[PDB]
From Swiss-Prot, chain B:
Residues 1-72 form the RdRp Nsp7 cofactor domain. This is Non-structural protein 7. It comes from the Viruses. It is found in: Host cytoplasm, Host perinuclear region; Host cytoplasm; Host endoplasmic reticulum. Coiled coil: none annotated. Interacts with nsp8 and nsp12 to form the replication-transcription complex (RTC): nsp12, nsp7, two subunits of nsp8, and up to two subunits of nsp13. Eight copies of nsp7 and eight copies of nsp8 assemble to form a heterohexadecamer dsRNA-encircling ring structure. Plays a role in viral RNA synthesis. Forms a hexadecamer with nsp8 (8 subunits of each) that may participate in viral replication by acting as a primase. Alternatively, may synthesize substantially longer products than oligonucleotide primers.
From Swiss-Prot, chain C:
Inhibited by Remdesivir antiviral drug (GS-5734) through non-obligate RNA chain termination. RNA-directed RNA polymerase that catalyzes the transcription of viral genomic and subgenomic RNAs. Acts in complex with nsp7 and nsp8 to transcribe both the minus and positive strands of genomic RNA. The kinase-like NiRAN domain of NSP12 attaches one or more nucleotides to the amino terminus of NSP9, forming a covalent RNA-protein intermediate that serves as transcription/replication primer. The chain holds residues 4793 to 4925 of 7096 of the full protein. It comes from Severe acute respiratory syndrome coronavirus 2 (2019-nCoV). Its cofactor is Mg(2+). Zn(2+) 10 binds at C87. Interacts with nsp7 and nsp8 to form the replication-transcription complex (RTC): nsp12, nsp7, two subunits of nsp8, and up to two subunits of nsp13. Interacts with nsp9. This is RNA-directed RNA polymerase nsp12. It catalyses: RNA(n) + a ribonucleoside 5'-triphosphate = RNA(n+1) + diphosphate; a 5'-end diphospho-ribonucleoside in mRNA + GTP + H(+) = a 5'-end (5'-triphosphoguanosine)-ribonucleoside in mRNA + diphosphate. Residues 1-133 are annotated as: RdRp Fingers N-ter. It comes from the Viruses.
Length: 523, 72, 133, 131
């Protein structure tokens, strides 16, 4: 048999002089005498011939000990989100001096970048091979008409590969230490990646210590993401084949199933975004795993501690304010009381009851469609759960998906994929859910003794001059300090601001009011 | 990255101008020329060489004691 | 007017580093992207004013086709028949921001507030009547 | 159109060596880990009489060495990559090469490793008049 790899595309019919023919199948047949070759001095070697060499069907699945795999499995990809980047290419056919092969033209990534490159290909010469510019034309498909003007706007390839290294470098320098490309029509993209990729044994950066992901041909040196200026080769990408995962028709119809957000403006970045959106759906819109971990990049533990503090405070305050008989917890897979001591009846619900504590954790998938008229006693508590419109009694805390930060990564469909430890995927944000509630207004409830020295009451507890009207912590009157309460108020305010800047929004039943906390205070 | 070059060039010209360099005349013309050329450049390398040529001006004078701020 | 020609220069803009750090922190200004920095505060050197006043050399005497002009002027006028105009007294003009420059040589003694505040309505109407002749 | 050129038994090797950064060491590591060497080389027909000098204009073997189509031996010329000759073309494109029939099963490996002594014009070890 044969393959299409290195399939010649020149239009001349005569074979090559054996001494300049790369293989035993690409010789001419006058020399072919019983599978062997005999030099016939009646004909000499040509001294001018320029045969384009198609570069498709590469097929790379080897096993060498020093070299890392290039196609990774599904689990090794799930672990390394943060590093996924879509990829799509558009093509063009060769015209006059050759025919039968495609050349890369427009490149598109998950970022909304679109590069165009002049058509270039690998030509031969009687002395060597050659990377030169060749003539081409767009595909005769009508929908591909938005490619006709692009054929005179190209760039020399070196500019393109430098731009690519730079775009990747400042997209990923603060997230991963690699890159994995998600792609669909695997073959042609692998073909295109001949232009700017180079593989080889694992290496570490120079003047930095992280693994190296860049190559420079001039100086012959590697680089990480940070220290990579002037370098023009990606040194060890990883890949993934989404269509390999058991999908049927074109990705357009497949994506069209769920995400109604990403339309199709006719470019390549659109295809890249759709591919990545689909890959995120296929692996993450399910239930969240607790065995997957992620490194911290960074500052995150502050956000976590802030969430702890604010949860404790808000729930304690709501209880002491209204004194609910029963606390209908919801969405808690670990029956752990947030406020530690609370005489209120404390339920636990979930749509995923654990093995143990299942007797505590009753199975329950909430939906306002049905359970709207069920828990009309006490109050619920939707900490980070994600349902439709919440019941008029609740204490919801829901992550807004519109904020920008390096922690949450775009997902489907409009909902984004938060990543702290174990990746949480949250649906799109909308207002219809909170039609029964109102934003929790800031406050600070304390209930404990005061400074000291005095350790009694009015008025021997140390006062400093804090004048704020919302630290509801009798002892307090305008001098309102008892040191303890004062710097505690400062700390908690800082924590609240950090939490609510990270993205989380709060809400409370409409009945809430602060004054009754003062009413509690009078002793 | 290139945006960082453009930005630091803006700040450098501001410092020069507030060091009274515009009093002299041909020097200020050259500084303005280099600044406006950097703001319109397209590739990083030649922008960097214009940047060093323009910083040489601030270094050639003894108004700013760099041995102080270079303390990290 | 005076013994030595003045050379005016144009200073460069000012940088708001906090906002730039914010915007690059949230992932903006990527290489090769579409949105970017294209609008700056360009500086000019000495002979900037005169080198721009010199741009009038593109104004040349022009003789117009008198008949077609005399027709299009009528049509243009017809585009303009829904309004109403006419002289008004001094006590009906509306000046927003009476605190701008008053041209030369009046800018040696204050802004437009002064002259609009030191001439009674009689003097203003008299000035109008004067320029009508 | 065009004409096919490589047999399916070469796809992995050719790809993995056309993407590498050091084609020579890549191929050596490929062999050294249980690989099947490259094999649709053009094979000549001659008298096995003449100089032992492999690099020649016309197939000139002895009873032991074996004439091969030169250009189809330079790995660089085979994967369609650039040559490391500082300037600037492969030399084996145009000539014939003669390899000891023993090792002449793998032509490309031999061409990569051994070299012709400049004096005797023959392979260093197969054979050389020098010393
Ligand atoms: Mg498209
Ligand atoms: Mg496409
Ligand atoms: Zn580095
Ligand atoms: Zn060669
Ligand atoms: Zn010798």
């Amino acid at each position: 048999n044969v393959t299409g790899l290195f399939k010649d595309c020149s239009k001349v019919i005569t074979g090559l002089h054996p001494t300049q023919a790369p293989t035993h199948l690409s010789v001419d047949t006058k020399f072919k005498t019983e599978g062997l070759c005999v030099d016939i001095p009646g004909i000499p070697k040509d001294m001018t011939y320029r045969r384009l060499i198609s570069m498709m069907g590469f097929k790379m699945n080897y096993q060498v000990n020093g070299y890392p795999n290039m196609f990774i499995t599904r689990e090794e990809a799930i672990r390394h989100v943060r590093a996924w980047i879509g990829f799509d290419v558009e093509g063009c056919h060769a015209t006059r001096e050759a025919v039968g092969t495609n050349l890369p033209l427009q490149l598109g990534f998950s970022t909304g970048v679109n590069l165009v490159a002049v058509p270039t290909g690998y030509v031969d010469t009687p002395n060597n091979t050659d990377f030169s510019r060749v003539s081409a034309k767009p595909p005769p498909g009508d929908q591909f008409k938005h490619l006709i003007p692009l054929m005179y706007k190209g760039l020399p390839w070196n500019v393109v590969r430098i731009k690519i290294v730079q775009m990747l470098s400042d997209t990923l320098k603060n997230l991963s230490d690699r890159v994995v490309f998600v792609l669909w029509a695997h073959g042609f993209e692998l073909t295109s990646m001949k232009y700017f990729v180079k593989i080889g044994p694992e290496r570490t950066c120079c003047l930095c210590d992280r693994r190296a992901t860049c190559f420079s041909t001039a100086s012959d040196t590697y680089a990480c993401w940070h220290h990579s200026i002037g370098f023009d080769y990606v040194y060890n990408p990883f890949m993934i084949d989404v269509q390999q995962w058991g999908f049927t028709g074109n990705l357009q119809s497949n994506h069209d199933l769920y995400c109604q957000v990403h339309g199709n403006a006719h470019v390549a970045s659109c295809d890249a975004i759709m591919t990545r959106c689909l890959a995120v759906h296929e692996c993450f819109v399910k239930r969240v795993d607790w065995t997957i971990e992620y490194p911290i990049i960074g500052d995150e533990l502050k956000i976590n501690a802030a969430c702890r503090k604010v949860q404790h405070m808000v729930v304690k305050a709501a209880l002491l304010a209204d004194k609910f008989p029963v606390l209908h917890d919801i969405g808690n897979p670990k029956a752990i009381k947030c406020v530690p001591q609370a005489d209120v009846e404390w339920k636990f619900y979930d749509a995923q009851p654990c093995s143990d504590k299942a007797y505590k954790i009753e199975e329950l998938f909430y939906s306002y469609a049905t359970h709207s008229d069920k828990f009309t006693d006490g109050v619920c508590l939707f900490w980070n759960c994600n349902v439709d419109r919440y019941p008029a009694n609740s204490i919801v805390c829901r992550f807004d998906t519109r904020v920008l930060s390096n922690l949450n990564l775009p997902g489907c469909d409009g909902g984004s994929l938060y990543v702290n430890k174990h990746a949480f995927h949250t649906p799109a944000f909308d207002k219809s859910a909170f039609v029964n509630l109102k934003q929790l207004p800031f406050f600070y409830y304390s209930d404990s003794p005061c400074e000291s020295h005095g350790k009694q009451v009015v008025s021997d507890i140390d006062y400093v001059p804090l004048k704020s009207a919302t630290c509801i912590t009798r002892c307090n009157l305008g001098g309102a300090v008892c040191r303890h309460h004062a710097n505690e108020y400062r700390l908690y305010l800082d924590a609240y601001n950090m939490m609510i800047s990270a993205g989380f929004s709060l809400w409370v039943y409409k009945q809430f009011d602060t004054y009754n906390l003062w009413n509690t205070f009078t002793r | 990255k290139m945006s960082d070059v453009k930005c630091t060039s803006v700040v450098l010209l501001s410092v020069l101008q507030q060091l009274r360099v515009e009093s002299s005349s041909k020097l200020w013309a050259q500084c303005v020329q280099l600044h406006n050329d950097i703001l319109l450049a397209k590739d990083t390398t030649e922008a960097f060489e214009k940047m060093v040529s323009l910083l040489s001006v601030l270094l050639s004078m003894q108004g700013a004691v760099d041995i102080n701020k270079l303390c990290e | 007017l005076t013994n030595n020609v003045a050379f005016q220069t144009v200073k460069p803009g000012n940088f708001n580093k906090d906002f730039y750090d914010f915007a690059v922190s949230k992932g903006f200004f990527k290489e090769g992207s579409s949105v970017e920095l294209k609008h700056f505060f360009f500086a000019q050197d000495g002979n900037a004013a005169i080198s721009d006043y010199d741009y009038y050399r593109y104004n040349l005497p022009t003789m117009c086709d008198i008949r077609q002009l005399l027709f299009v002027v009528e049509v243009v006028d017809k585009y303009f028949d829904c309004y109403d105009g006419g002289c008004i007294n001094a006590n009906q003009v509306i000046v927003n921001n009476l605190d701008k420059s008053a041209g030369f040589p009046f800018n040696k003694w204050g802004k437009a507030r002064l002259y609009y505040d030191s001439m009674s309505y009689e003097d203003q109407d008299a000035l109008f009547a004067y320029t009508k002749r | 159109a065009g004409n096919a050129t490589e047999v399916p038994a070469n796809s992995t090797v050719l790809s993995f060596c056309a993407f590498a950064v050091d084609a020579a060491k890549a191929y050596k590591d490929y062999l050294a880990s249980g690989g099947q060497p490259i094999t649709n080389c053009v094979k000549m027909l001659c008298t096995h009489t003449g100089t032992g000098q492999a690099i020649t204009v016309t197939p000139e073997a002895n009873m032991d060495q074996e004439s091969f189509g030169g250009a189809s031996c330079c790995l660089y010329c085979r994967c369609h990559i650039d040559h490391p000759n500082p300037k600037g073309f492969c030399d084996l494109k145009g000539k014939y090469v003669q390899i000891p029939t023993t090792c002449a099963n793998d032509p490309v490996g031999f061409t990569l490793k051994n070299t012709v002594c400049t004096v005797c014009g023959m392979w260093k070890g197969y054979g050389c008049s020098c010393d």
